[PDB]
Design a binder for this molecule. Structure first.
Ligand SMILES: [Zn+2]
Ligand SMILES: [Zn+2]
Ligand SMILES: [Zn+2]
Ligand SMILES: [Zn+2]
Lengths: 114, 20
């Protein structure tokens, strides 16, 4: 019986929308989070359910599995991964102008084929 | 994109700063 760190409604009712939604969870804590409250998308939402999404401050740069220079550590908008902008295949250098995406979604974009 | 720092890892509300 947990709740999301944003509205703190629960995995059956969202106190930010008023809709029932399963709560996500962190790996270092286990804190829940509504993919909607989290600003996720069906992709991020699903992704977090696939692995250990972790709760932001735990969301280490999957690339380094550290989070050290988190000052750059972006958060994918298709899975919610963690990438220090200078770890990315095409290093960001500075927070993307628009929507940023990690390699997982892309790898998924190709592998999705037969 | 929101980085793990000042971006508060959350969509804020825009910022007055036209890209050079
Ligand atoms: Zn919530
Ligand atoms: Zn955590
Ligand atoms: Zn890194
Ligand atoms: Zn991604």
């Amino acid at each position: 019986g947990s709740y999301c760190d944003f509205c703190l409604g629960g995995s059956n009712m969202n106190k930010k929308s008023g809709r029932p939604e399963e709560l996500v969870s962190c790996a270092d804590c286990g804190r829940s989070g509504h993919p909607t409250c989290l600003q996720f998308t069906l992709n991020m939402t699903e992704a977090v359910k696939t692995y250990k999404w972790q709760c932001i401050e735990c969301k280490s740069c999957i690339l380094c599995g550290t989070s050290e220079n988190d000052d750059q550590l972006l958060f994918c908008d298709d899975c919610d991964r963690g990438y220090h902008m200078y770890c990315l295949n095409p290093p960001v250098a500075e927070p993307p102008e628009g929507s940023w995406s990690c390699h997982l979604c892309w790898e998924l974009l190709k592998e999705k084929a037969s | 994109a929101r980085t793990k720092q000042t971006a508060r890892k959350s969509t804020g509300g825009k910022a007055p700063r036209k890209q050079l």
